Amino acid sequence: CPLMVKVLDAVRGSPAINVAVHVFRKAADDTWEPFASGKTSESGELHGLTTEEEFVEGIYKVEIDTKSYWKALGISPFHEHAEVVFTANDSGPRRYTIAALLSPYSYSTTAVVTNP
Amino acid sequence: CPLMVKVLDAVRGSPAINVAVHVFRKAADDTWEPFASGKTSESGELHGLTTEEEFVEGIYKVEIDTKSYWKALGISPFHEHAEVVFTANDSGPRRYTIAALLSPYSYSTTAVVTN
Amino acid sequence: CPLMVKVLDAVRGSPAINVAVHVFRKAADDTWEPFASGKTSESGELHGLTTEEEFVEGIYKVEIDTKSYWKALGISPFHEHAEVVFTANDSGPRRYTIAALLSPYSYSTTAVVTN
Amino acid sequence: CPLMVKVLDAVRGSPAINVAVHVFRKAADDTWEPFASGKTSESGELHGLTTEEEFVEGIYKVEIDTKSYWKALGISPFHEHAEVVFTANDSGPRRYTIAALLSPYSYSTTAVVTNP
Numbered sequence: 007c008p009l010m011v012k013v014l015d016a017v018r019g020s021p022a023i024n025v026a027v028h029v030f031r032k033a034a035d036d037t038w039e040p041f042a043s044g045k046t047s048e049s050g051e052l053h054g055l056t057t058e059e060e061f062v063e064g065i066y067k068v069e070i071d072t073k074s075y076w077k078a079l080g081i082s083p084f085h086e087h088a089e090v091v092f093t094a095n096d097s098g099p100r101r102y103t104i105a106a107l108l109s110p111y112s113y114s115t116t117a118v119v120t121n122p
Numbered sequence: 123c124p125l126m127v128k129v130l131d132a133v134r135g136s137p138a139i140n141v142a143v144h145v146f147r148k149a150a151d152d153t154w155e156p157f158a159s160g161k162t163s164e165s166g167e168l169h170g171l172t173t174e175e176e177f178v179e180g181i182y183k184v185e186i187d188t189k190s191y192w193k194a195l196g197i198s199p200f201h202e203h204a205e206v207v208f209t210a211n212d213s214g215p216r217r218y219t220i221a222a223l224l225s226p227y228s229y230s231t232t233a234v235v236t237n
Numbered sequence: 238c239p240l241m242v243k244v245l246d247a248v249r250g251s252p253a254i255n256v257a258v259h260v261f262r263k264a265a266d267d268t269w270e271p272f273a274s275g276k277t278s279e280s281g282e283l284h285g286l287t288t289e290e291e292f293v294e295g296i297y298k299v300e301i302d303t304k305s306y307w308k309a310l311g312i313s314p315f316h317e318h319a320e321v322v323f324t325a326n327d328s329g330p331r332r333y334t335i336a337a338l339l340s341p342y343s344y345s346t347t348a349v350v351t352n
Numbered sequence: 353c354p355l356m357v358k359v360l361d362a363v364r365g366s367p368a369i370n371v372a373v374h375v376f377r378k379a380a381d382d383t384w385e386p387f388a389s390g391k392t393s394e395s396g397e398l399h400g401l402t403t404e405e406e407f408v409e410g411i412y413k414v415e416i417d418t419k420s421y422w423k424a425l426g427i428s429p430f431h432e433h434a435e436v437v438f439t440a441n442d443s444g445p446r447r448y449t450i451a452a453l454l455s456p457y458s459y460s461t462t463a464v465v466t467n468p
């Protein structure tokens with residue numbers, strides 16, 4: 007699994023469940039091409055977005071749809087989404103975890119990058 | 123100042139100085155139109171981006187060029203930039219402060235919306 | 238102000254007002270002696286805790302009573318308080334800003350150490 | 353496993369490996385009694401601190417020894433340690449994960465609390 011997303015909820019002290027995630031790749035024409043999408047599980051994790059073969063070098067944008075998440079819980083949050091934009095695999099294949107911690111007016115994100 | 127940006131460096135425990143910031147507004151055709159830009163000051167702040175008259179309700183994107191900041195310190199960072207995307211509301215007089223805390227593989231952003 | 242505390246609320250996107258803050262210094266016998274205290278202002282800030290003369294090198298603990306803050310908003314929070322424990326250095330003129338960002342089950346704290 | 357600690361490094365984009373963790377419980381006399389300790393693994397995780405039987409209701413302090421961690425990497429950090437103080441199990445037994453994200457002048461911590 008070369009690209010995984012994990013999301014926690016700082017209001018409830020829980021995984022952030024059923025958070026939509028859309029991944030885009032920058033195309034040769036400098037537009038954002040849809041690449042993969044999914045939703046976090048009961049554990050707040052989203053696995054299976056892509057494969058090592060498909061996850062080539064490029065600039066990727068991971069959009070975490072935080073507004074849609076908070077609105078269901080009856081919170082009107084600040085952000086439209088949390089965006090994570092990064093160059094991937096430019097020194098060979100790596101495994102990436104994007105971790106995010108959500109509050110209605112704040113989010114914190116990091117990356118864990120490992121060499122398989 | 124209806125819109126202020128503040129950037130901190132979590133490695134050095136300092137303001138993040140001379141960081142480029144670009145602000146865009148979402149146009150009717152779902153593209154991002156340039157709206158305002160600047161560089162953070164010695165205090166890590168960027169004031170005077172816009173005015174109450176120009177800053178109408180809409181979706182805005184604040185792009186903070188964190189990659190250039192880290193590279194200038196000899197650090198290969200993770201992100202291309204930090205992006206903060208939000209709808210401005212009237213409603214909630216008035217002032218938006220977008221704060222960002224930067225690490226090489228991390229950032230956190232918070233909005234302080236006050237009167 | 239060699240020592241300032243700033244507290245933000247990540248649920249409301251606001252300063253955290255009327256938050257009690259206690260500062261302690263580590264005594265020679267490894268106990269924490271009261272040093273300074275106050276409540277955050279309407280801007281979420283607490284100034285005037287100490288003076289350059291009194292704030293010597295040493296280990297300090299800043300205790301932020303986050304539990305009372307959340308309970309007053311009807312929220313059962315996780316932490317008893319937020320604690321920030323650090324050595325003050327001379328060296329690095331001079332000013333310490335301890336910032337804290339509060340959520341019910343989370344907090345983040347950052348130090349801005351400037352001249 | 354009713355008490356687990358997970359720690360990430362925001363400078364290196366990795367788990368925070370070999371971070372010492374000391375847990376204390378507030379005693380009847382309002383002093384902090386040593387309760388459990390250990391170090392994070394290669395995955396940044398610390399399991400096996402306590403048992404459900406031993407982890408009774410109380411106020412617990414989890415001290416994450418961040419200074420000792422950064423100094424080895426030749427960084428002189430700001431904090432002595434990151435402290436997490438919380439009441440546990442006061443509505444029955446729960447499982448607690450304390451997650452922390454470390455930078456030299458900043459740390460971010462949350463709790464994931466689940467009901468077994």
Ligand SMILES: O=C(O)[C@H]1O[C@@H](Oc2ccc3c(=O)c(-c4ccc(O)cc4)coc3c2)[C@H](O)[C@@H](O)[C@@H]1O
Pocket residue numbers: 012013014051105106107114115116230345358359360395397451452453460461462
């Ligand atoms: O490897 C393992 O065995 C386990 O590692 C965990 O991964 C982690 C580790 C740390 C964090 C974390 O620390 C935060 C976080 C905290 C504070 C912030 O400000 C931002 C993010 C988010 O999720 C995480 C997720 C993950 O939950 C499991 O799937 C995996 O099996």
Ligand SMILES: O=C(O)[C@H]1O[C@@H](Oc2ccc3c(=O)c(-c4ccc(O)cc4)coc3c2)[C@H](O)[C@@H](O)[C@@H]1O
Pocket residue numbers: 114128130219221222223230231232234243245280336337338345346347460
């Ligand atoms: O006195 C000044 O000139 C100005 O200081 C600013 O204070 C601060 C100081 C520190 C932070 C900070 O550090 C964070 C933050 C962000 C992400 C985190 O994960 C943790 C903290 C948020 O905004 C801040 C805001 C404040 O916004 C202004 O009102 C004030 O006039």
